[PDB]
Amino acid sequence: MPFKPLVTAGIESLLNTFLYRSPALKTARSRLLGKVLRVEVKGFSTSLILVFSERQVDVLGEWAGDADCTVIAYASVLPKLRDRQQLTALIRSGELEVQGDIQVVQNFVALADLAEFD
């Protein structure tokens, strides 16, 4: 199946430098341990699968299995997922569609928010 290896490797390195380089974020990352988040970017044919472990997040373009959480949005909603206080508004407006366990995306957005200085 099309794994899109160059794009997924690039997204993986980006997410690992941003979220996993700092050991100060360890306890915030512990909330996502063993979780599988499926990201469907509207207009794109392939899904992105994020598998969280202690050392890093692995990204795949193809997954045989279930995701704990699935998020559907247009590309312009992705930069908005670095703010915990605006996730409820995005979900309410339908800009971000959530299937499965909403806690997985809430925990991810809380992590990304703590990863970056405003």
Q: Which residues bind Ca ion (CB under 5 A)?
A: 58, 66, 68, 82, 113, 115-116, 118
Answer yes or no whether residue 26 interacts with its own copies by CB under 8 A.
no
> In which element (H, E) is residue 90 found?
helix 87-93
Q: Residue 29 burial (CB < 10 Å; 0-12/13-18/19+)?
A: buried
* d(C-alpha 81, C-alpha 90), whole Å: 9
**CA nearest neighbour of 61 among 6, 23, 108:** 6
* d(C-alpha 77, C-alpha 91), whole Å: 11
Q: Residue 58 binds which one of its own copies, Ca ion, Tb ion, none, with CB within 5 to 8 A depending on kind? A: Ca ion
CB atoms < 10 A from the CB of 97, how many? Answer: 14
Q: Which is nearer to Ca ion, 62 or 116 (CB)?
A: 116
**How near is the Cβ of 66 to Ca ion at its closest, in Å?**
4
Q: Which is nearer to Tb ion, 2 or 23 (CB)?
A: 2
**How near is the Cβ of 101 to its own copies at its closest, in Å?**
25
Q: Please report, as ranges, the residues that interact with its own copies according to CB under 8 A.
A: 1-3, 6-7, 10-11, 13-14, 17-18, 21-24, 41-45, 74-76, 79, 82, 115-117
